[PDB]
Amino acid sequence: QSPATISLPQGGQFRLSISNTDPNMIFIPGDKVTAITAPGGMLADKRLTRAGGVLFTSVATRTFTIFVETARGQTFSVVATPVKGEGRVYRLMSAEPPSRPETRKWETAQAYEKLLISLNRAVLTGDIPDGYGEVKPLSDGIRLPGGFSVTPLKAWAGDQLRADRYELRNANTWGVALREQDFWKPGVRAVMFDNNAQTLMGGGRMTVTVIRGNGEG
């Protein structure tokens, strides 16, 4: 079975049967019961379970009202009718959620990946990270699908990595879908396309930044 779930506004009153013979439990998920009150003599024993919750036994034969107070300031009321049977467990819920905790992105990318991403972003804006002094670009970097002519514009060189910018010419007249891995050359770390690719048309000049290792041949 599954605990019976009851949703109540603060001060809410729910009529639930309990058991005279066996221990009964009431837990509020995410909350710790701090107090319990019942008419006198009605509840024989009250103990706090692990992770909140109350375990309680009743020798009573009369319907009674129990008030339970949680640590987050919520108070609920229950009307309990004692009846023969198995100990009953109830899950207490709050009708209105008090607050919405903001989501937490815990995932962390790899160091190499973040390094390339940071540089690509810096180049896209144009601000230079320290240790990047600018350099002549090569012609080695770009393989051309066809109809493309490459001219180097700007390039940065640093202590570990190197970036450069080449502008491809407009292709002929057939639409040329642009594949970011179709401009690959051994030795290149990352290649990214400015704007959104998605087929340069019967023409268009698009600047492409190519990232390659530094020092290593």
């Binding site: 190499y112 570990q160 891995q181 690959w184 051994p186 030795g187 770390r189 290792g213």
Partner: peptide, 15 residues
């Protein structure tokens, strides 16, 4: 830096 080992293969339904 990292190895960057693969030289890429030479040469839905996306090749």
């Amino acid at each position: 830096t990292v190895s960057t080992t693969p030289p890429v293969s030479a040469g839905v339904r996306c090749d």
